[PDB]
Every structure is written in structure tokens, then in C-alpha cells.
């Protein structure tokens, strides 16, 4: 949904964005691992295990 | 919400007064988009003649930059509220957290030069879903001074204007409430007295040829500034004490 | 502590996927980064500047 | 001396999923038909979606009905994601009346034969007062692409009421479309591919009807090359 | 800035890519050969290219030969106007080279072609840098493995000059300056221990053994092409981050 | 539901034509530009030489005596030979030439199954006193493009050491590159305007090539459309 430019990180040394862009991806790999686990209505036993 | 926060957000959407923080724990008793009624609990109830509490919200109202600041309920009927809990969001808060903007799937790569400098590309699934669409609330004021040539009026009759423009405003002169106006429409019909014509010689034949009745009153109404369009959500009228209130007033 | 969160989500640990082009259909070699940055929208709107 | 593909099984995994496969593809035509279909399905499928709502006692979007627990600015942002498939006509005018305490799901719209709601478990608003009452008259249309309310105003033609709340309409029954050519196998041919278009609609349009209306949007457009005008 | 990284990616060469050693038949076959998907954008190849050379009173002449190049440089040769020589697009083509490749087109061919040759570059850098995916991650910046020992030795070697001010073996002014120039030793054995790990980083194989090359590290390519920033800033994303000055102007 | 078809489909000339086309629907500027471009480059029936029998030499890094260029260059002079054949599907020419001077391609035999379209396309420059050049060139029809590297690797037509193999380009095209750029229909700015730019090796005129490639494409869509 956006296409940023990678020639902004070498000169300006904000390596925050390139780390917030990964940890912001692990935290949305869960949201698709739960949204499926909850869409077949597995149980309130599998959710509490994940 | 910030998908990657820093934990120091609940202390910024509570310390500022934007949130409608609950003042005594209890049980919600009536939710509504403009009112919350918190049935107080037992022990946190005053000694004599206590009853219940009630919080009002503040629907669409204009801040200092012309953005809107409106609150919303975030609780249903039956929630046990508590001291310091939250009942209403504000402008950019969610469930108490402080969400300043939206978070969207980003990728780092050069794409055909449409992000040459620091600039940004944007998919069209971010315009359809309407996640970056904000609301702005302007305001316009039409004062009718007391000239030394006779006073102005707020009459809804205006010299040489066709009904394509006098469609929205009712007979009292002010516009309606909810009429979607655009650039150039009229919002308040106002005419000012003008004499001292002294019209040119060439045009003074142009009048006698057709009979154009000269103007006793000049048109100085309030028309919407160019390049803008939005429903007229509210109208207020102030009057000097000593002049009658027309029907719309 | 990040990479151990991606591996729980089945995502690739390095944080870089292979994107396919949108118009042609071929695949960008040397995979690209894809994450979830949190984008504000400052109020230097355009139709108040022109 | 060429081969031409034929439709094959349609593994309807779920209501909004699908997997249609195109069995006998000649070599080299894998990515040529795929990406020339993914760019058609995602762009130009005719769908139907709400066009303008109208509530009983409210004048503009930023109001707030008494009894409901949402501003009207969120009752429109919940209708816009309503999926409905009219069969006979081109446009409809739905209705919705309800009274009592309890969430107003989409399943309470008045029933008609042609109009056929797809997600009846939807939520629209809430009611939270015994003497509350909501009564709107939704509209529905057919089209394609996306037409925001601001640009559907140039064809207003004197929209006389001040009770009409205009919604933006994004008619499209497709959400994401993958596809992955893989090693098909006819009885004796060294290299034959298989296309597997893992579609995903919003429960509106049939899968096999999409592809038969995304091919003829191509096969009708290539005429201008088959006969070069000069 | 962006085009100059497009061209640097288009005119490098790997060591063993798809379709190495084959022999093409001009710029036109060398392009479609890569579009179709057989050969790689930088794979060493032998093409035949006719260059022109204005040597009489303003007249061009042809000279057909067998240049030894990549597939990338050939595709870029179909853009250069007539009068230029093929030793202009045969280098690695960083940013100091493009800056002159326009200059030698001004001095020779005047300003009718150079204004229309300074656009086929922009329409080619922007294209071949978008279908190359020049991303950047959090493991493109390779920390050197010997950063510890280089930091712990000068961590101890300076704990034993502070002692030499305990027992008065040295005055302070020859304590201060003798502690500065020992860190400058360690501050420079980290850059020299990092850049030697980015430059020759990759090691790929021929058909037989393994032989090393220049790297393909997306945070090195944006430094070596001069597209954005150089080793005075790569040294802070991987190496040690200098020594700072307090408000006086003193270290 | 009811789409837009192009008018003002202009075409140019130079065997090198720069077609144009407009106004296509928005986003249709590319799914047409790339469907075609992947057909003229990938699969299109055509004829092209594949192997050569140098009458004396058995290895490419050897050298023929008397011939100016070496066999790593002559094959470069044969990989671009423009041949069309109406009747046959496996024709093997013969070029046994003598003399001295630039040996053009018109000195081949003239069999009723072939018809060159570029006779003066030179193949070799002969020295003096030799006049000894004879070869059996083999041309067999096919589709697309197939290098000689990925054939001997799977060597199945077992040939003794010295049956030279060449890179075969079967397609009648030599370059094609579309280019989209915005246009308008006097009230909408979300339109397109395709620009194709095509070349061929003589054996087919350009605009004729696009015609019989939007046909191969609209055949694969036969079992779908109504």
C-alpha cells in the first residue's frame, strides 16, 4: 500500500524505520495466524494455547 | 492504534482532557452517541441522597485549526466501569491508547521514479477504504452593520439574482441546515443601501432602451469561498437587544 | 527478540519477501522488504497551499 | 500446431474463496494469461453496492440520532461494506425498519425475491432504548470500478432533497487474486502447464462467471489488433 | 540519485550467471535475450557492436568488431548517440562516469543530441532500477566479527596508561593526548575491518573452484555508486561511531 | 459492463514501424502491451538455421585455412540469416564457394523449397588462392528462441566431433518495446495511449506480425468467451 524509497536510509541514519518495519511485520503475522484460527472457530482451547 | 507502540501512550490520552474518563466505578446503564449514564456502585456512593452519575459527550465541534473534535462511546450496556476507566474516545484515541495515524503495509524499493526524492507512492486501496480522509469544519460570519446612510438588511430578496442561487436559502434569508453548498453559492442574503448613482452617459442610454430599473440597494451578501463544498451543519444568530427577531431568528 | 517473533508467525526470519511486479508479472530479483510502518498525515494539505 | 486450454474443476473451498484451474496450457502461456487476467478481474468486474442512504429524521451526516449508539457518520461507513446481488433489475430501493433494544443486523432488511443479501450476520448499528426506532431506505446500483460521491455529483440533476445522504460506491466483487502456473501433465507431453487462479470474492459473484466475463473483456479488445486500421 | 543506482546495477557483472560465455550478435539480440528470461542482466558475454567515429571534417565512419562485455552494457549501448566510443559505457559506470559521459557528448555532438541523450538515461535508469528490487534490510549492514577484540584491547591498553598517571610517570597533557591517539588506532582498525568485509564480501563459484568478487550488498551499492552517502556514514551503521566533541570544541 | 474500444489507431513506416493506439481504458494500456510483447518474443512459428557442416574443420576453437574471420565469427554471420520456406519443414542448403573477395550469401544454391530475402548479407571474406569453402547448413522450422548451450547439454542427435551447432532464433522479430502514456477523451483523464515500436528480419512486415499475434492470443481465449 506504499512504496517508500531506500535511498533515504544510507544518508539520513534513521535505522528506526527499518526495524519498526520488521517488528511491525511480526506483529501482523500473528494477526493473520489468529484471524484464521478464529475463522474456523477452532475452540477457546486452541486460542488460549497460541 | 500503533502496531508498534512504546507503552507511554495511555498516559497521554488520559492526562489530556480529550477522553471522558470515568469518575466513579459502577455499571453502565444507558449508552448513546451523545450521553452515557453510569449507575454508581454501592460503596462509592455518597452518604445521603446520592443516586447515579452522568457524563455528556461533545459531538461535532470546531477546534482551533478548523479540524473537528468529537467523542464516541466505547462501552455497551452492562460493562463494569471502574475508577479511572475510559468511556469515550476523542480525536485520535482508541480504547484509551493514542492513535495519531494509520498503519499500512509498506515496501522499500525504487519504482519507476515515482518516488524519486523523499516522495511517496500510494496504492488506491488506501483511497477507497477511506483511512486517511479527515474532516474539517470552517466557519463564516456575516455582520450587518448600522451604516450612516440607513441600515443594512438580511432580506432574502436580492437585486438581479436568479433562482438557481436563491434555491437553498429560505424566505428568511439564512441558508438551511444540511443543504450541500459548493463554491459560489449564497449563504446569507444581505443588501446595503446605496445612492449617489451618477451613471455614465453611454450607459444612461442603455437604461432608457430597455427600462432597467436602477438599484436602490447594493448586493453584499455572503457567498461561500471558492473551492469548497460541505453541508452547512449549524447556524447561529446574534441580535442587538432592541431590534426584532425575524422568523428564522 | 524480533527474529524469534517472526519465526513463531511462519514469516521468513530475514524479513524480506520476493515481490512480483504488478504490470509485467516477472519477479524482482534480490528480494524486497515488506513491513507495516505507521504513517501519519501532517496538515500541510495541498488545497490550502495553492 | 497449438494447444488451447479448457476449464476444469472448481474447488470451492469456502463461500468467498475459489480455485479455478485451466488445464492444458502450451508452454510459455502460463504467465501470459495469468497476469493478463489478474489485471482484468481486479479492475473491471461489474458489481452492485449501495449508492445513497436516507434516514427518517436526520438531515446531514454529522448528526446523531437519539436512541442509536453511533453517529450517522458510522452508519454509512458500515453500509458501504454491504454485499448484495440483484438478479432481475439494474437498481433497487431496499428498506429497513426495526424497533427495540438489540443490534440491527443486515438480515432485517425487507425481503424481496430479486434482491438477495449474502452476509446476513452483518452488523449495521445498535439500538439501546426500548422506544428507539430506526427506519432507512437504502439504494443499490450496478456498475464497476469506483465512483466517489464528489464525482457522481456532476450528474446530480437537481438532487432536490436535503435528506439524501450520499455514500461513495466501490462496486467490485474481487479482493485479491493469486495464481501460480505449475507442471501440468497430459498423458504424453514433455511440458504442459496448469494455471490455478486462487480467487477471493466478497461472496457476490460466481467464480466461473468471472473468468468467462474476464476473458471476453480481453477477447473483445484484441479485435483492434486483429484488424489493423492504418 | 535514483537513476545513477539504476545504471550501476545495469552495468556490473557477476561471475557465473545465466548464459555466460555465449556470443551475441548486437545490441538488439542482447536485449530480447534478457527480456525473454534466459540470460541475466549482468553476465559476461561477447557481442559485436559497430561504433562510429567522426574523424574527417564532420563525417562518421563505422567499425565493426567483437567487443567483450556483459549483457547489461550492450543494452545500454542502444541509447548512446552515434559519435561516441564504446569505451564510454564499458566501465562499471558509477556516478563520476555518467557525469562525464554527458560532458563528452556536449563537446562533440553539440546540444541537439545531448538534451535528448540526457533523457534516454533517465528513462533507462528509472526502469532498470525498479525491476531490480534494490531494497535494504537490517542484515545488509554486516557488523565485523573482530569488533570485540579490537575494542577490548584498546579497552585494556588504555587502562594501563591511566596507571602511568597514577605513579606520575607522565604529565596529564601527555596522558590525554596519549589516550586520544590510542582510540584513533582502534577507530581505524574497525573501518579497515569492516569495509574489507563489505567490498569483497561475496564469493561465488566458477564451474570449478570458488573465486571472490565485488559484493552485492544493497547498503554498499548505494555507497559505491555515489547515489547517496559514502564510507563516512557506512562506518557508523556497522563500524564504531567515532568520538564526539563537547561544547568547548574539545574531544 | 459496456467497454471502450480504440479509434484513431495510427500506424507509421520506416521494416520498422511505430504503431500507436488510443484511447484504451485505464489500465488496459499494459495488459495489452505485455500480452503481445510476450508472444513475439517467446512463441511464434518461424524458420532458422540450426547446424553447419564446415567441410574441413572439426572444432570451433580451430581455424579454417584461407577464410578471413574465424568460425566463432562466421556462425555470427549465420545466426542472422533471413530465410522463409513455403513448402518444406526440413531443408538443408549447400554453400560450396570459390573465388576471392567478399563471399555474399547469394552464392548459395537456389532450391524450389526456399527463398532468401537478403541475398547480399555477407557470410565470409575469402583470401587469395584458397577458394575452398563448402558447408551444409540445416534449417528446420520452430517456435521462439532456443540457444545452442541447452541442446548439446542434452545431446541426443549424436554427431561426430565437428558437427557445428548454432544459436537458433526462430521468431520473425528482432525487437519490440511498447510504451504507455496518458491521453484523454475530452472529458476524462484516466485514459491511456499505447505505443508499440517493432522491427523484423525481413521475412515478415511489422504490422503483419502484430496481426498474427493478436490471433494466437485470441485463440487461447476461445474456450472461455461467449
Swiss-Prot record, chain B:
Paired cysteines (S-S): none
Residue intervals passing through the bilayer: none
Name of protein: DNA-directed RNA polymerase subunit beta
Quaternary structure, from the entry: The RNAP catalytic core consists of 2 alpha, 1 beta, 1 beta' and 1 omega subunit. When a sigma factor is associated with the core the holoenzyme is formed, which can initiate transcription. The rRNA transcription and antitermination complex (rrnTAC) consists of RNAP, NusA, NusB, NusE (rpsJ), NusG, SubB, ribosomal protein S4, DNA and precursor rRNA; S4 is more flexible than other subunits. In pull-down experiments interacts with CedA.
Biotechnology: Co-administration of salinamide and rifampicin or salinamide and myxopyronin suppresses the emergence of resistance to both antibiotics.
Gene source species: Escherichia coli (strain K12)
Family: Belongs to the RNA polymerase beta chain family.
Whole-protein residues included: 697 to 945 of 1342
Role this protein plays: DNA-dependent RNA polymerase (RNAP) catalyzes the transcription of DNA into RNA using the four ribonucleoside triphosphates as substrates.
Lineage: Bacteria, Pseudomonadati, Pseudomonadota, Gammaproteobacteria, Enterobacterales
PTM entry text: Acetylated on several lysine residues in the presence of glucose.
From Swiss-Prot, chain E:
Post-translational modification: Acetylated on several lysine residues in the presence of glucose.
Effect of residue 1 to P: Resistant to antibiotics salinamide A and B
Annotated phenotype, changing residue 232 to T: Resistant to antibiotics salinamide A and B
Record note on biotechnological use: Co-administration of salinamide and rifampicin or salinamide and myxopyronin suppresses the emergence of resistance to both antibiotics.
Quaternary structure, from the entry: The RNAP catalytic core consists of 2 alpha, 1 beta, 1 beta' and 1 omega subunit. When a sigma factor is associated with the core the holoenzyme is formed, which can initiate transcription. The rRNA transcription and antitermination complex (rrnTAC) consists of RNAP, NusA, NusB, NusE (rpsJ), NusG, SubB, ribosomal protein S4, DNA and precursor rRNA; S4 is more flexible than other subunits.
Chain's role: DNA-dependent RNA polymerase (RNAP) catalyzes the transcription of DNA into RNA using the four ribonucleoside triphosphates as substrates.
Family under the similarity heading: Belongs to the RNA polymerase beta' chain family.
Record's protein name: DNA-directed RNA polymerase subunit beta'
Organism expressing this protein natively: Escherichia coli (strain K12)
Name of encoding gene: rpoC
Amino acid at each position: 500500500d506504499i512504496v517508500l524509497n531506500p535511498l533515504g536510509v544510507p544518508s539520513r541514519m534513521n535505522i528506526g524505520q527499518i526495524l519498526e518495519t520488521h517488528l511491525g511485520m511480526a506483529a501482523k503475522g500473528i494477526g493473520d495466524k489468529i484471524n484464521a484460527m478464529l475463522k474456523q472457530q477452532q475452540e477457546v482451547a486452541k486460542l488460549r494455547e497460541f | 492504534k500503533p502496531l508498534v507502540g512504546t507503552g507511554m501512550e495511555r498516559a497521554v490520552a488520559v492526562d489530556s482532557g480529550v477522553t471522558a474518563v470515568a469518575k466513579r466505578g459502577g455499571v453502565v446503564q444507558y449508552v448513546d452517541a451523545s450521553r452515557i449514564v453510569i449507575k454508581v456502585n454501592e460503596d462509592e456512593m455518597y452518604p445521603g441522597e446520592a443516586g447515579i452519575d452522568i457524563y455528556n459527550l461533545t459531538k461535532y465541534t470546531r477546534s482551533n485549526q478548523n479540524t473537528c473534535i468529537n467523542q464516541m462511546p466505547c462501552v455497551s450496556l452492562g460493562e463494569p466501569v471502574e475508577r479511572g476507566d475510559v468511556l469515550a474516545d476523542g480525536p485520535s484515541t482508541d480504547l484509551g491508547e493514542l492513535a495519531l495515524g494509520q498503519n499500512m503495509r509498506v515496501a522499500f524499493m525504487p519504482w519507476n521514479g515515482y518516488n524519486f526524492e523523499d516522495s511517496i507512492l500510494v496504492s488506491e486501496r488506501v483511497v477507497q477504504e477511506d483511512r486517511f480522509t479527515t474532516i474539517h469544519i470552517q466557519e463564516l460570519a456575516c455582520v450587518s452593520r448600522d451604516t450612516k446612510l440607513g441600515p443594512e438588511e438580511i432580506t432574502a430578496d436580492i437585486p438581479n439574482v436568479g433562482e438557481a442561487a436563491l434555491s437553498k436559502l429560505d424566505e428568511s434569508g439564512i441558508v438551511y441546515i444540511g443543504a450541500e453548498v459548493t463554491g459560489g453559492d449564497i449563504l446569507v442574503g444581505k443588501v446595503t443601501p446605496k445612492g449617489e448613482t451618477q451613471l455614465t452617459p453611454e450607459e444612461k442610454l442603455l437604461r432608457a432602451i430597455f427600462g432597467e430599473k436602477a438599484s436602490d440597494v447594493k448586493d453584499s451578501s455572503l457567498r461561500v469561498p471558492n473551492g469548497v463544498s460541505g453541508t452547512v451543519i449549524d447556524v447561529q444568530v446574534f441580535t442587538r437587544d432592541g431590534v426584532e427577531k425575524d422568523k428564522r431568528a | 527478540e524480533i527474529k524469534e517473533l517472526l519465526k513463531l508467525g511462519d514469516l521468513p526470519t530475514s524479513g524480506q519477501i520476493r515481490l512480483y511486479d504488478g504490470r509485467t508479472g516477472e519477479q524482482f530479483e534480490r528480494p524486497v522488504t515488506v513491513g507495516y510502518m505507521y504513517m501519519l498525515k501532517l496538515n500541510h494539505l495541498v488545497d490550502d497551499k495553492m | 500446431e497449438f494447444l488451447k486450454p479448457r476449464l476444469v474443476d472448481i474447488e470451492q473451498v469456502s463461500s468467498t474463496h475459489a480455485k479455478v484451474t485451466l488445464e492444458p496450457l502450451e508452454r510459455g502461456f502460463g504467465h501470459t494469461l495469468g497476469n493478463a487476467l489478474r489485471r482484468i478481474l481486479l479492475s473491471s468486474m461489474p458489481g452492485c453496492a449501495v449508492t445513497e442512504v436516507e434516514i427518517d429524521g436526520v438531515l446531514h451526516e454529522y448528526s446523531t440520532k437519539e436512541g442509536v449508539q453511533e453517529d450517522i457518520l458510522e452508519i454509512l461507513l458500515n453500509l458501504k461494506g454491504l454485499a448484495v446481488r440483484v438478479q432481475g433489475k439494474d437498481e433497487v430501493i431496499l428498506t429497513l425498519n426495526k424497533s427495540g433494544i438489540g443490534p440491527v443486523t443486515a438480515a432485517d432488511i425487507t425481503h424481496d425475491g430479486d434482491v438477495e443479501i449474502v452476509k446476513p450476520q452483518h452488523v449495521i448499528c445498535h439500538l439501546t432504548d426500548e422506544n428507539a426506532s430506526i427506519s432507512m431506505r437504502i439504494k443499490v446500483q450496478r456498475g464497476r470500478g469506483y465512483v466517489p460521491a464528489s464525482t457522481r455529483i456532476h450528474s446530480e440533476e437537481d438532487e432536490r432533497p436535503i435528506g439524501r445522504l450520499l455514500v461513495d460506491a466501490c462496486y467490485s466483487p474481487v479482493e485479491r487474486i493469486a495464481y501460480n502456473v505449475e507442471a501440468a501433465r497430459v498423458e504424453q507431453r514433455t511440458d504442459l502447464d496448469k494455471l490455478v487462479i486462487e480467487m477471493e470474492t466478497n461472496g457476490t459473484i460466481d467464480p466461473e462467471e468471472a473468468i468467462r466475463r474476464a476473458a471476453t473483456i480481453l477477447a473483445e479488445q484484441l479485435e483492434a489488433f486483429v484488424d489493423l486500421r492504418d | 540519485q535514483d537513476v545513477v543506482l539504476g545504471l550501476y546495477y545495469m552495468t556490473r557483472d557477476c561471475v557465473n550467471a545465466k548464459g555466460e560465455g555465449m556470443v551475441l550478435t548486437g545490441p538488439k539480440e542482447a536485449e530480447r535475450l534478457y527480456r525473454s528470461g534466459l540470460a541475466s542482466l549482468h553476465a559476461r558475454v561477447k557481442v559485436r557492436i559497430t561504433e562510429y567515429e567522426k574523424d574527417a571534417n564532420g563525417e562518421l565512419v563505422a567499425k565493426t568488431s567483437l567487443k567483450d562485455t556483459t549483457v547489461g552494457r550492450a543494452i545500454l549501448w542502444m541509447i548512446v548517440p552515434k559519435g561516441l566510443p564504446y569505451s564510454i559505457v564499458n566501465q562499471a559506470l558509477g556516478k563520476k562516469a555518467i557525469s562525464k559521459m554527458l560532458n563528452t557528448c556536449y563537446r562533440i555532438l553539440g546540444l541537439k543530441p545531448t538534451v535528448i541523450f540526457a533523457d534516454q538515461i533517465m528513462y533507462t535508469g528509472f526502469a532498470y532500477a525498479a525491476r531490480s528490487g534494490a531494497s535494504v534490510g537490517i542484515d545488509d549492514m554486516v557488523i565485523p566479527e573482530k569488533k570485540h577484540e579490537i575494542i577490548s584491547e584498546a579497552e585494556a591498553e588504555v587502562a594501563e596508561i591511566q596507571e602511568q598517571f597514577q605513579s606520575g610517570l607522565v604529565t596529564a597533557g601527555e596522558r590525554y593526548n596519549k589516550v586520544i591517539d590510542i582510540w584513533a588506532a582502534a577507530n581505524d582498525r574497525v573501518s579497515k575491518a569492516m569495509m574489507d568485509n563489505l567490498q569483497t564480501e561475496t564469493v561465488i563459484n566458477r564451474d570449478g573452484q570458488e573465486e571472490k568478487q565485488v559484493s552485492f550488498n544493497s547498503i554498499y551499492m548505494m555507497a559505491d555508486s555515489g547515489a547517496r552517502g559514502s564510507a563516512a556514514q557506512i562506518r557508523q551503521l556497522a563500524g564504531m561511531r567515532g568520538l564526539m566533541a563537547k561544547p568547548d570544541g574539545s574531544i
